[PDB]
Amino acid sequence: HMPRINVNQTDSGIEIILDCSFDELMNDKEIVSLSNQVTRAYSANRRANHFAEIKVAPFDKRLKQRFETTLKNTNYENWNHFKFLPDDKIMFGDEHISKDKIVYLTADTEEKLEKLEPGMRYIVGGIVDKNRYKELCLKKAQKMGIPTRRLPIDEYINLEGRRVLTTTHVVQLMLKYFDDHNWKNAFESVLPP
Ligand SMILES: Nc1ncnc2c1ncn2[C@@H]1O[C@H](CSCC[C@H](N)C(=O)O)[C@@H](O)[C@H]1O
C-alpha cells in the first residue's frame, strides 16, 4: 500500500538476509519478539538515509503464521525494499549476488568486518535466544560454506554490556553505518552509552 518513507533515502547497495530458519528453537514469546524485530527492521529501513534490500528467508512456520494473523494488517507482502522468501536458496547465491559475495555475521568468529560493501549480501541470524544456543550461527555458516565476520564493535562495548546484539539492532547499526562509514558513530546511534 502506501508506507511512510524517508523520501531523500538512497540505495546502500547491500542486501541483508534475516536467516529465519530457527523456528523450532524458540518458544512462543520469542516468536513474538522476532516478528516485532522484523517490523522494527522495516521501520529502520524506511527511515534510514541509506536503505538496504532486506529479505526474510526462509519465511515459514510460526513466524509466518503470526504475520498471516496478528500482523495481517501490516501489508507485509507489499513492503518497500523488504521481501519474504519461501526458502533459504538466496544464501547460496542467485542472479543478483553470487556465493563469493555472501558473508554470515556472527559474534563468535575472530575475524572482524572492516566495512560494508555495495554488491555484497550479509546474513544475520533471525533468532531470539539471548545467545543460549552458543555458536549456532557460526557452526551453521561453516556447514553452508559461507565465510563468517563479526561486527567491529567490541572496542565500544564494556564487559558488563551485551555484545551479542538483537537481530534488529544489527540491522539498525548496519544502516546507520552508511551515514558516515564510522562504526563507532553507528554503534553510539543505535546503543546510546
Ligand atoms: N557482535 C556481533 N557480530 C556479528 N554478528 C552479530 C553480533 N551480534 C549479533 N549478531 C547477529 O545477530 C543475530 C542475532 S543474535 C543470535 C545469537 C545466536 N546464538 C547466534 O549464534 O548467532 C546473530 O545470529 C548474528 O547474525
C-alpha cell at 17: 538476509
Q: Which residues fall within 8 angstroms of residue 66, CB to CB, at 6 or more apart?
A: 31, 32, 35
Give ligand 1 pocket residues (Cβ under 6 A): 105-107, 124-125, 127, 129, 131, 133, 135-137, 150-151, 163-165, 167, 170
Q: Give the side-chain half-sphere CA count within 13 A for 55.
A: 17
Pick from 168, 189, 173, 171: which is nearest to 36 by CA? 168
Pick from 162, 42, 37, 38: which is nearest to 107 by CA? 162
Please, which residues bridge with residue 35 across strands? none
Structural method: X-ray
What spacing in Å lies between the alpha carbon of 1 and ligand 1's midpoint?
A: 32
Q: After which residues is the chain broken (C to N over 2.5 A)?
A: none
Per the annotation, the verdict on 100 as an active-site residue is no
Letter string b/e over residues 132-145, b meaning 16 or more CB atoms within 10 A of that residue's CB: eeeebbbebbeebe
Cα 140 to Cα 137: distance, rounded to the nearest angstrom: 5
118 upstream amide cis, omega within 30 of 0: no
Our CA angle for 76, 80, 81, nearest 5°, is 110
CA distances from 62 to 22, 35, 72 (A): 10, 10, 14
What spacing in Å lies between the alpha carbon of 174 and ligand 1's midpoint?
A: 13
What is the structure's resolution, reported in angstroms to one decimal? 1.8
CA distances from 31 to 61, 63, 66, 143, 162 (A): 10, 6, 8, 25, 21
User: With the C-alpha atoms ordered 26, 28, 30, 36, is the resulting torsion angle positive or negative?
Assistant: positive
Helix runs in 93-164, H state only: 136-144
Pick from 32, 30, 51: which is nearest to 42 by CA? 51
Cα 174 to Cα 16: distance, rounded to the nearest angstrom: 9
Q: How many CB atoms within 10 Å of residue 77? A: 10
CATH level 3 topology of 1-193: Alpha/beta knot (3.40.1280)
Pick from 191, 114, 120, 108: which is nearest to 157 by CA? 191
What spacing in Å lies between the alpha carbon of 178 and ligand 1's midpoint?
A: 20
